[PDB]
Symmetry: C3
Subunit: 86 residues, 3 copies
């Protein structure tokens, strides 16, 4: 469900923010999570992060905009809390 | 082939045990290997490891239980040896 | 487009050579890039790197041969520069 998606993305971002995983690990993990649920635009945003064209804050902003366009309410709160933590 | 799958999974786990790769790298690599061979339940178990809901030992235990119902004998030996190393 | 593919592969190899990512991260990233563009032989070569049967130089060599067979010209230049940087 979309609750487990939000929980997993929030957990991955939490491990990134505590220093347990680095930027490439975060990119790979979050892109895999997004691909496993069928959301490809978010996967493209994480692909842009993985390449290096954007940073974590930019990726979070574009992910929040895409979630707004997709109506993923549980993921919007996770992304906003992550944005304010950075 | 199933022997090559067992060889690659064993090599990845041996890399993790020595200290060459960490938990996230091992999760991503083993999930990729399992997805490349069409074993989806094993992929879900490695996904739970990547999320953070289980550890390496628990993942090995559930992987062995799932490989028992699949008839992957070489993978069973690989997982048993990896379990006893831990 | 094949220009974006070559750009991303060159960028990933450049991060590897600068030392900001390691061998497993490079393998995962380059395999993901190759799979996202529908090139499977390149993906198999990167998979062989991921397991540990070949190193980065050998992978770059076989990737160059595969790109010669596929007629991808920008990838050839990227791989040649990466080979000579090693
Ligand atoms: Zn991708
Ligand atoms: Zn998965
Ligand atoms: Zn693969």
């Amino acid at each position: 469900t979309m609750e487990e998606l939000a929980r997993r993305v929030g957990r991955a971002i939490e491990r990134y923010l505590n220093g347990e995983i680095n930027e490439v690990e975060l990119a790979l993990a979050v892109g895999h999570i997004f691909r496993d649920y069928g959301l490809e635009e978010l996967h493209e945003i994480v692909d842009r992060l993985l390449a290096g064209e954007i940073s974590v804050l930019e990726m979070l902003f574009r992910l929040y905009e895409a979630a707004v366009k997709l109506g993923l309410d549980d993921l919007k709160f996770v992304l906003l809390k992550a944005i304010f933590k950075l």
